[PDB]
Amino acid sequence: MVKLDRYIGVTVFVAILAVLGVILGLALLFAFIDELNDISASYGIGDALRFIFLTAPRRAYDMLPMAALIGCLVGLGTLASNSELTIMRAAGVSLSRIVWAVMKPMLVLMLAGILVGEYVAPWTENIAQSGRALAQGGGDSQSSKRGLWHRQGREYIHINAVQPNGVLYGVTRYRFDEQRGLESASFAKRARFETDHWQLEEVTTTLLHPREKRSEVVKLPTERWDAQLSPQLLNTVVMEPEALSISGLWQYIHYLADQGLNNNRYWLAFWTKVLQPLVTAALVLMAISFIFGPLRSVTLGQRIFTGVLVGFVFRIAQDLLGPSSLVFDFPPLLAVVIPASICALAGVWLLRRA
Amino acid sequence: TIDYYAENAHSLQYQEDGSLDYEMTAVKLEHQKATDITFVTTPDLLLFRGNVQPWHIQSARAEVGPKGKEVELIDDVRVARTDAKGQPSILTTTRLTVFPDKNYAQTEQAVKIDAANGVTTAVGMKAYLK
Amino acid sequence: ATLKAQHLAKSYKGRQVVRDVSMSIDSGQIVGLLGPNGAGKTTCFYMIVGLVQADQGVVRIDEQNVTHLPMHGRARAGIGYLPQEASIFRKLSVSDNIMAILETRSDLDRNGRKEALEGLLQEFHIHHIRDNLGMSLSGGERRRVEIARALASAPKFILLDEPFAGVDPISVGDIKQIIHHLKAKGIGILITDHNVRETLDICETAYIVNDGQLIAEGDAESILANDLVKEVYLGHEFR
Amino acid sequence: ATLKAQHLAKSYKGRQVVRDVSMSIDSGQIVGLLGPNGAGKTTCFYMIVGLVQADQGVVRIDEQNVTHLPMHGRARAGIGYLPQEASIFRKLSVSDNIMAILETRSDLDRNGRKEALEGLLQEFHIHHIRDNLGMSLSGGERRRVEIARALASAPKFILLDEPFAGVDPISVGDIKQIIHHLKAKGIGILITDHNVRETLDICETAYIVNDGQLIAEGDAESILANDLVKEVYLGHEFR
Amino acid sequence: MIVFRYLSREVLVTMSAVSAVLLVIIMSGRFIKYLAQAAQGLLDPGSLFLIMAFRIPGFLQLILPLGLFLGILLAYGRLYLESEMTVLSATGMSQKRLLGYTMAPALLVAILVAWLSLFLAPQGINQFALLLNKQDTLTEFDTLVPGRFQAMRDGTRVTYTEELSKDRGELAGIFISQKDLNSSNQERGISILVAEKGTQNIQADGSRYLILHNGYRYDGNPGQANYRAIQYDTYGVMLPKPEASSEVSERDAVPTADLFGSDNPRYQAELQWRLSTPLLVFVVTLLAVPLSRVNPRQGRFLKLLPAILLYMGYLALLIAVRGQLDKGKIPMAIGLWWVHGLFLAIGLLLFYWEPLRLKLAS
């Protein structure tokens, strides 16, 4: 069997590509409209367009399963409602063969999707986030949301922006005393990680000697300070848990497990990143089962409507199960497995119902 | 509602130049958020650089307006000024409202400014600091 | 080879549709299924095809019980089907339309597949339209292509639903010619249609059903002359 | 009053469907519009109804140019219509099914409305099913209720659409009798469908269109005897 | 008259079903957005039920016009598909008659949404805030990881402690940082609080009371030398209501009684926004009927997503215009009615397309 497999695969692949394109267009439009509220005469509209365009691949990978579901629905529906699946079945071809014929381009698709995600997506996400943080955080002591707080010893450190060149932007540190009386307050625009130690550029510290003596301010272009934080950790911590590579997630999970800090969120992120082929296959099987059952000879608009409704239901369910695992100590892998398991069970039941 | 309530309240406010404009000392400090008017009872207020003359303030009842709009001192407030008379000579003030912007110590009530050692009493009181 | 549907019956959501209907179709015989739209003619036809499962009764093709077998199992057994609506492959050419079905057969080899392609293409006079795509193809040529596609599977029996419905009287002659040619090879054909006259003309024996049980059977002349069928479904005015 | 259609034409995407087709239907006679499916028979019927706006030509009922007028304007002018599919009000009683249309008639009081409802209820022998819901009716009662509603609209001509499409031979007589009653009332009727025999039997005059032009017209016997329609539409073997 | 009741009943039933489904979906989405925060560091699971039960009326307000829209679309598409609408139009009723019939369910929905906008929703949100503050308790003091930095109100407030007692209060050294916006930091600088132990008290007389064992307050620009340092043993904290600020603005719970009389441009914009929903319902009803004409080729559900996106665009444009209005950039005389006029013009052109084309056909 050659020609029928090629026909079915080409039809489903083209339909899914069109659905993915439309979904990406809508998602980009909605993200841009929501994000346009942050213009501040220092972060221009062109910068917002760049950020949206550079972050597009991440949401493409994010919305790939629903796009595959909807595209497989409509495409197979076109062939069925047109009365050709009946002919293919009455020729001797079994339902399993049709399912495998649909699965083969789907195999290609999830292979490609896992590849593009795990390799490209963190890179573009890092570029976009670094650009946005650079655009926003070039302000004052602390004037940006995309910043980080950290404490070492009795010195309190804040960063306005972190860049992929190890160049922290807008760092401020307050040094205190055992009695916790303020002694110095500093702020430097830029900070560079030399191999031996961190280095500053054009610090603007001030000195407040504890007694009533003269309060002075001292400026040094290249003050030096030492800490334990590293840029390799810096780029990982600022990024969202949904944006790192699979290998990066694994390494950071091991790093957190080494020192005992809880890492359930990154466990859930790893589980939803790795198990993407399983959820995609379950959803596509459910779509195939719908096409062969109630959605036999209905209009294409009805197919699209029920597809988007089911996709919204599935996304809402799996988003509810995410934080619920953290709240109720519920093992994270279950939160990914259950919606897919329910979907696959319903699909196989309706397929067995013929 | 009392937003902030402190015991043994000591304030050290270094001015932009580096010399403390004023340094609040008090047994207690109180603040309200619903109205940012603040009550400070039983303080010992010291303003060495707030005025050219060293200033010692001993208030039985005191009150400070929102954002430092106004300073209300009640119940025979003793304020010290240093003219050629070097002694602080805490000066009794029954009730007054001091504008921190120009140190305009407007008086809401008749004030009997009497030196601790000598007699400098004045009947009535009219406030023109500007 | 004979197809025997014995004691077929089925009860739908609230009311039974078919009760104890029996049909025997032989290889080389045309049999028509006729009856009121309310009666279970379409339901029984779909049981014989296998689209709807039957609650009771056995269907066997040459001593092989195919009741449990699904539609693909029945198709591999030898039963064929054509739907009333257009069923051509739109984006695929006619030659590809026949070749896709030819690839399904396990017995035939590459040389055999090509030879069978050429034989069916020349046989039904669809040689001139091999390159043309299915969508642009006309209605009559579409019916010829569908018939050739069904025949490419080498079915022991082929079942037609509403073949004469919605067809101009000049083309029903071509339809009967194609039916006769399918007869010539030995394949038995079962026809269900709304148009009484053309079927009672074409098929040798007709089965008339009502209330889920057959009421009359025999040749067309005996079908016309029977009083029960005239009272209920034919009418006194007909013929 | 006569519904007169002159020099109608239509052009689709890049192809003209109908060229210079003229018709005349007069009150008190039945006229059949027949033709090949590919030809502009359905196009002429629809552009007479008003579903599709004619590109050229004038359609006129008693010296009123009703081409530009919408469907509601045509209905107010005197043209009725009955769709092919079921058009009975599902969740409405039969008596209410007729009253909903009777109420829109301006020239009637409440007493006259009740009297007209009773007369229409009694006329078509649908008196006893007045309380049953619209969905519950079978085929024949549904058709009778539809025609009674169309009469309740008080039209001057009713344009039937495929009355004998998928209808049992016994139930055809009821439709024929109802059309005879409508004609006897004084309402001209135009009929178009694929089943040639019955429309040729009932209609007084038949209009045949092919390639978007009126190839032949006349009484049924003349349509049967004409050479061109037999060659291209009817077939030599026909009749 | 009978057809009026028939159509009204179908529209009302379909609108009820669509409204129920949409309300379920929106409530679920808000539940995700709320449960994320409640999971990470803040809020308590016990108060979510009250929050949703008090926030529902606004969602019902924003949903009901859209629910009527689709209802109209689905019901009239179903009528067209089964040929009821054709046999109706084949009797003498026109699309103007359709609009006249449909206005009554539209009027009922307009009455309901007007009630929700004017009285129920502001009262609901006022009760939301007050009852939240009264009974609902917070967990920023109850549950913390000591080494973990806690940020409040996004970047404005950051709280950190060395160690927190599980029994709450009697903590270790605390680091409290607040950077108020609206040039308040420009006036003085950044205020930071440091204490030795601190004590948290929950009660009815005071919402949340924090008493330090020994503490300090330093306030001044990090680079500039002007500082204010306050030294003490005890200190206070009072009326902490983080969520209610993020949930709704102060203008949202303002009753409509004093809203129109006031001269604040924000309140004037809010008044126009609250009165926008009934005219929005009417415009949606006007532009819905012509769009319901569907042939069986394209089915019934084909043109539901375009309607959804059109309504979302309408709402977004309304929100943007209201924002520019309360900012004062847009003149108040023109106000908010111009977008409604534009959408009404679009709907009118859509409704009169066929008669205008026929007139152009001479």
Residue numbers in the entry:
A (entry chain G): 1 to 354
B (entry chain C): 47 to 176
C (entry chain A), D (entry chain B): 2 to 240
E (entry chain F): 1 to 362
Sentences from the paper on this structure:
The IM sub-complex comprises the ATP-binding cassette (ABC) transporter LptB2FGC, which extracts LPS from the IM and delivers it to the periplasmic components of the Lpt system. LptB2FGC is a type VI ABC transporter consisting of 5 subunits. The LptB cytoplasmic subunits form the nucleotide-binding domains (NBDs) that capture and hydrolyse ATP. LptF and LptG possess transmembrane helices that create a cavity and a translocation path for LPS, as well as a periplasmic β-jellyroll domain.
